Structures are given as C-alpha cells and as structure tokens.
C-alpha cells in the first residue's frame, strides 16, 4: 500500500496525457482520473493510521541509485515517517476532491483530459516531494511542482496575461531555487550525507539556514516573494485550490519543519511581516479570488512564525498546515461555484442574494470561513490558537512584536472574510446573470472537505490539542474578541476617508511596480550593454578594406 | 488632467466624457450598486449647477479642476465586464483560424529532402 | 471539399456547432472535444490494465518495505505482509500478531 500513494497519481497523469486518452475521450478520462485519485487516497489513509498512530516508519528503496560520484550519493529512496504520512494524507485527500470538482467545472473546456492529466502530474510530484528521504529526490519534487504550476497557471495560453503570470511564477521561484541549491551544497559539504535522518545540526555556518530559508520563502510566498502568488489567479479555479491548499505553497514550510536548521530571528520577522502585509492586502481587494489568495499568504506567515518558535512550534506549524489545506480548498471551490453562478464575474460589487448559488455552496463558504477566522471549537480554532498562545510565552523579545502583528492580522482576517460573505450573499442583488450550479460532483467535492474539517476537530493532528499552556483569561480569549470585532466592522460596512492610505494599500504597496524597474529594466539594459557595446563594439574586430 | 485624446475633443463631448467617467469611477469606488445610486444623483446635481454658465474662463477653470479630480481618483482596480478588454474572460478559447494542411509530405520527392551543399 | 476530408472524424456532440478547430491536426492527447465511438469498452480495458499495474506495484511495495522498528499495536499490513515484526507496545511489552497482550497479564 505504501508505494500506491506516490506512483499512482503519476500513472493517472501518464494515462490522461498519452495517446491512450485518444481512445477514452473526455468521458473516459474523467473516470480514469477520479479512480486513480481514490486509490491513492485509500493508500494514504492506511499509511496515516500505521505511521502516525502506531508509530512504525517504513523505508523503501524504489529504483536503486540515481547518481553517485565521489562522496555525493543520491538514491531513488523513500521514507515514510510522521511528517511524510501527514503530508501524504493531506495532499491526496485534497487532490481527490479537486479532481472530482474539476471533472465537472472544466466540462465545457475543449482539452479536458489534458487538464486532468496536468492536475494528476502536479499531485504526483507533490507526493514525490514529501515521500523523499534525501535532498535530491526532494529537488525532483520541487522542480516538478514548479513545472506543473507553470503548465497549469498558463493553461489558457491564448490570453497573454495568463502566459505572463506563469512566466512570473517560474522566475520568482527560480531565484529562491538557486539559493536552495547553494544551501544543499553547504549542508552536504559540512555533514557528509544527503539523507534527512543523518542531517542533525546543532551549530552550522549561518549561510545554511539563511539560504534554505530564502528557498522556502520562494515557494511559501513570503515577503518580497509573494508577488507571483496573486497573479497565479489567471489559471482556472481547481488550479488555484490545489496551489493554495495542498501543493506548492506548503512545500517550503514542510522543508523548514523537516530540517529545523533555521535561525529564529529571520524566520520570526519574515513570518510576522508577511502575515501583517497579506492581512492588509486582502482587506482592500475586490477580486473574489485575490482576497482568498492573500489570506493564504497570511496563514503561511503564521506557520513561518510558529516554526520559528521551536520544536513544539514546528509541530504546531505542521498542524496548522494540515488544517489549513482543507478549509482553504473548500473556500476556493465555493468561490468557483459562486463565480459560475454569476456569469464568470469575479468582482464582489456585483453579487448579492441567495439565488445565484446552491444551498450547499453557501454552507461550504460559511463553514470554511468560520474555520478560517478561528470561531471556537472548529478546525482552525485549535491550530491558530495554539500558535498564538505559543507566541505569547516565548522568551525571545523579538516574538513580542510578532505576537502583536499576529493579533492585528487576526482582526483583519475576520474583517475581510466576513466582507466576502456579506458582499456575496447578504446585500441586495447587483449582478445580471443567475445560473446556479447544483451538479452532484462539485457538491460531493465540497462535502468531503467539510468532512475533513469535522475530522480535524474530532481527531487532532498531533498531541498538542488539549494541552493547556497556562495563560490568563484576558490573554486567552482576546483572539475571540478580535474575531468579533472583525465581524461587527465588516457587517457595519464602514469605511475611512483617508483615500491615500486606501489607494496605497489597495495597490498592494507598489511591490510589482517597484520591481518592474529596480531589477527588471536594469537587467534588460545591462543586456543591451553587453551585446551592443561589448560584442558588436569593444571586442569586435573589423575587416581590412583593399 | 485629461489625456491627449480627451484634450482634442469638442467641448460638448469633453463635458460628456467627464460626466461619464465620473459615473464609472463612482461605480468603482462604491461597495454595491445600491450604494452607487445616490452618489450618481449627487454627481448629476453637481453638473447641473454649472449648466447656465457663459464665461469661458470660469468654464475652463471648472473643467480643468474636475479633470484633475478624475486623474486623482482613477481606481487601481476598475470593474470591467469579463468578456471585454481588461476583463477576466477576454481571449481565453478563441476559435482557431484556418491552417493549411500538406498531405504525405515525406512521400513527395523522396531521396532529395535535405539541405543543399 | 478536399479529397482527404472524407477520412476525418466529424466534430463530436460535445463540441459547440459554431466552434471551428482544424480537424486535420493530430493532437497527442485527443484534441478538441474528443468522443470516440467505442469509448466505454476502451475505458473498461484501460481499467483492467491499470488493475494489473496496481497488483504489480502492490507486490513490489510489499517485497521492498523495510521496518526498522516494531509497531506499537496491530497494523493492517500484518494481514498481507510476513516481514512485519511482532508489535511491541508503548510500555515495551511484546505482543501477539493480532495485537493483544499475551497470557500472564491479559484479563
């Protein structure tokens, strides 16, 4: 059962993209994709119960040695331990519902089986990433999900902005991939191996944690790397759900939790600044998918700070990752159903009422939104409150500012999520297209993720749930009051007259515009210099006329 | 200040474009359409208070000030219907143009299908 | 109409009638709204081949799984794998293969 969680989504992708799919068509390829995900989810459930609960890790030599020159030895080997089982359960369970949704959402697309094969490849490379036992097979998974993210973001290739969004995701992540590669070189040079179980670091040379942190900041879309994440909304809604829940953005946090070789000052500062920035960014957007994208960036900031706190903080970071994937995928699927019910419009000024959506879509948005804002005794309450209480008792003075930033971020999140519900359903109608979707497949796709939200409350992620870190009632129940403050403010729909702050925040602090000329235009101009002045000029040798 | 296109317009069409863009920017800055209706009424009453003017200098000063206001309050995220330019559904799955086909190209003039030297 | 146009597949019932897509192009994945006539039989045969691959990789995984620690209770891999060690619980006590405490401390 253990190799069935990794191979078999890759097999589904291989089937649906090869000339076998010429004989199946759309109708047969949908069956193949859904079955190939159901099998992998069943295998991951067995792996989860064996490794997490009964504590028996399994190591598999899959395809022998990859390459071995000198003392640099990379093998095709997996290891299934606690983190790997957690990640496999989360990835396969989310990707199954996203496949069941995409087989109905992209029904009218002309190349449906190609899209399903790309989704399966993306899932399989994520499984390869988390199942690897050494750094090089991890890099296979890293670049595989990067390539499949490029193929899926720029799926509608006749649209130029989608193509440029895919290229932007590739380039922004390529900077951090370079830094991560140099960090792998440092790690191997000063420890002698590439396998995770032999990488126990107490005191290393600083470049190790910094360069691995930069490589993780690329994929997890932290500060000065978040710019690709918002533009990745050019792709279809299943792509966004799988990018923001289970694949891609959770890979850097997984890598930092696995290695635990960071220096906590950088991690805490980057995470808290990212959380506050993405909180204020999502409060001032009107595109329905961009608000959810910025909430993803904000929660990744929370997890970054938590893994900065310590080993218990690393466990809480993995726990928040696991519970975040379910309600984030549910939020994106419900938003896709609302968009399709309103004629493709993504602006929240053109919604309202309870006619453009099913009852189940509204229930899904409500329950996932309540889990995200930390409503008591739902799924996100346990993990988010654990991170907040662990940040309130850290003995680092830097974590004092980080906790304040997290509390402000919590109020902002409960503001804009309540605004997303309020604009979508509570206000009067201001669109003109009412085509509500009530198909069986997307409704069952949403119901599965709501079942996982219930499961996280009933069965915890780890042993931290129910442990009491001893805090006064004032410190403990303040995030509930911040949630209520966000709800009351957003339902009052109040606004400020400070329009220059509004347009500074709504334009997202001008990061893209400043990047358009601080590295980008200089790279183009230095290329002009090296070609025209150097190759055609200073180094050019002419002819002798006679 | 207006762009080089709007500065080339006749005066009637210049004022009409200013009123139209003001209504659209009020749509962009509002939360809903039901928020937008009394702001649209107020903008209409604002233009009605300068209808009976004759002095071209006062007309020019009011026109230029309003164009400066519209350049200031240009929304960074305008509301565009999805299937038009700048919308989210523009240029996704267009019908293919007619592409020509050459049947059995390898079988035409075999043994002489390389590059000359 | 060209001579070779009679050999080509029509636009399928999934494709909108006003959509044009140059039917001469061979796409490796199937192309525009692919809907072959015998698709249910092909789907069943590909499901059978996938089941063959599933059995092959289940056998390979079972042959190559290494457990360096005994589990802390009964695991479902005991049913199909004979290399799974006997469970040793959280207190260090050796257990039976069905996951119960042996005689001397049971009931």
């Amino acid at each position: 059962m253990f190799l069935l969680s990794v191979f078999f989504p890759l097999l589904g992708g291989l089937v649906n993209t090869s000339p076998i799919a010429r004989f199946l068509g759309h109708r047969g390829s949908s069956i193949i994709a859904i079955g190939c995900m159901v099998v992998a989810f069943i295998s991951s459930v067995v792996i989860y119960y064996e490794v997490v609960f009964m504590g028996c890790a399994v190591s598999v030599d899959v395809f022998g040695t990859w390459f071995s020159v000198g003392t640099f030895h990379a093998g095709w080997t997996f290891n299934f331990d606690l983190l790997t089982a957690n990640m496999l359960f989360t990835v396969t369970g989310v990707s199954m519902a996203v496949h069941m949704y995409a087989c109905d959402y992209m029904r009218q697309d002309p190349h449906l089986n190609l899209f399903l094969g790309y989704l399966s490849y993306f899932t399989g490379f994520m499984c390869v990433l988390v199942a690897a036992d050494n750094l090089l097979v991890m890099l296979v998974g890293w670049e595989g999900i990067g390539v499949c993210s490029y193929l899926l973001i720029g799926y509608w290739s006749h649209r130029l902005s989608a193509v440029k969004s895919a290229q932007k995701a590739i380039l922004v992540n390529r900077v951090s991939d370079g830094l991560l590669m140099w960090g792998v070189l440092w790690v191997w040079y000063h420890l002698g191996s590439l396998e995770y179980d032999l990488l126990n670091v107490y005191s290393a040379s600083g470049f190790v944690g910094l360069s691995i942190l930069i490589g993780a900041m690329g994929k997890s879309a932290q500060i000065l790397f978040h710019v690709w994440l918002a533009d990745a909304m050019e792709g279809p809604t299943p792509v966004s759900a799988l990018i923001h829940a289970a694949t891609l953005v959770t890979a850097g946090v997984y890598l930092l939790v696995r290695l635990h070789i960071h220096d906590e000052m950088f991690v805490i500062i980057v995470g808290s600044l990212t959380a506050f920035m993405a909180g204020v960014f999502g409060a001032t957007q009107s595109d329905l998918k961009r608000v959810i994208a910025y909430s993803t960036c904000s929660q990744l900031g929370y997890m970054m700070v938590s893994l900065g706190l310590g080993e218990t903080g690393g466990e809480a970071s993995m726990g928040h990752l696991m519970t975040h994937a379910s309600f984030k995928a549910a939020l994106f699927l419900a938003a896709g159903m609302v968009i399709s019910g309103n004629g493709g419009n993504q602006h929240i000024a053109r919604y309202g009422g309870s006619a453009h959506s099913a009852m189940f879509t509204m229930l899904t948005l409500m329950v996932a939104s309540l889990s995200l804002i930390g409503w008591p005794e739902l799924s996100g309450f346990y993990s988010k409150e654990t991170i907040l209480n662990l940040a309130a008792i850290c003995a680092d003075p830097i974590a004092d500012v980080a906790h304040t930033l997290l509390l402000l971020t919590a109020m902002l999140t409960s503001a804009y999520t309540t605004k997303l519900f309020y604009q979508c359903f509570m206000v009067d109608f201001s669109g003109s297209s009412v085509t509500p979707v009530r198909n069986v497949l997307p409704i069952l796709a949403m119901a599965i993720l709501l079942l996982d939200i219930m499961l996280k409350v009933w069965v915890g992620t780890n042993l931290l749930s129910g442990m009491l870190f001893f805090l006064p009632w004032g410190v403990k129940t303040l995030p509930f009051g911040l949630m209520v403050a966000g709800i009351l403010t957003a339902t009052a729909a109040v606004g400020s007259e400070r329009f220059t702050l509004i347009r500074f925040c709504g334009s997202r602090w001008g990061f893209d515009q400043l990047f358009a000329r601080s590295p980008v235009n200089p790279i183009f101009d230095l290329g002009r210099i090296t070609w025209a002045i150097g190759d055609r000029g200073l180094l050019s040798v002419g002819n002798l006329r006679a | 200040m207006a762009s080089e296109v709007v500065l080339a317009l006749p005066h009637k069409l210049r004022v009409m474009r200013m009123y139209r863009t003001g209504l659209k920017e009020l749509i962009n800055w509002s939360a809903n359409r039901h928020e937008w209706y009394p702001r649209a009424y107020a903008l209409r009453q604002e233009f009605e208070d300068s209808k009976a003017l004759t002095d071209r200098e006062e007309i020019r000063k009011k026109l230029e000030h309003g164009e400066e206001l519209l350049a200031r309050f240009r929304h960074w995220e305008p509301l565009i219907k999805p299937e038009f330019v700048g919308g989210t559904a523009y240029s996704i799955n267009p019908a293919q143009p007619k592409l020509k086909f050459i049947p059995n190209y390898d079988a035409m003039d075999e043994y002489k299908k390389g590059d000359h030297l | 109409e060209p001579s070779w146009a009679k050999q080509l597949a029509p636009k399928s019932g999934l494709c909108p009638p006003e959509f044009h897509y140059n039917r001469e192009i061979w796409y490796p994945h199937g192309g525009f709204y692919c809907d072959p006539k015998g698709w249910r039989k092909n789907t069943l045969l590909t499901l059978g081949g996938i089941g063959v691959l599933l059995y092959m990789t289940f056998s390979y995984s079972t042959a190559n799984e290494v457990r360096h620690m005994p589990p802390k209770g009964w695991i479902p891999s005991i049913m199909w794998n004979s290399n799974v060690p006997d469970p040793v619980d959280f207190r260090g006590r050796k257990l039976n293969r069905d996951g119960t405490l042996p005689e001397g401390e049971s009931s």
Binding site: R22 | - | E24, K37
Partner: peptide
Amino acid sequence: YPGGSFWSEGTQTGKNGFLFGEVPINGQPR
C-alpha cells in the same frame, strides 16, 4: 451530453487527425 446521459455512445468515427501528416492513398498500406 449526447443521447441525454453521460453513459451513451460516442459520436466520432474516422481519423482524429493524421499522424505525421500521412493520409492513406486508396486504402493501401503506408
């Protein structure tokens, strides 16, 4: 869906494009 259901027959017979641009001449083998 054609036929009124997901589980009906397919609706395409013949070549779904020509591999390598090769068209059969008079039904002869290539």
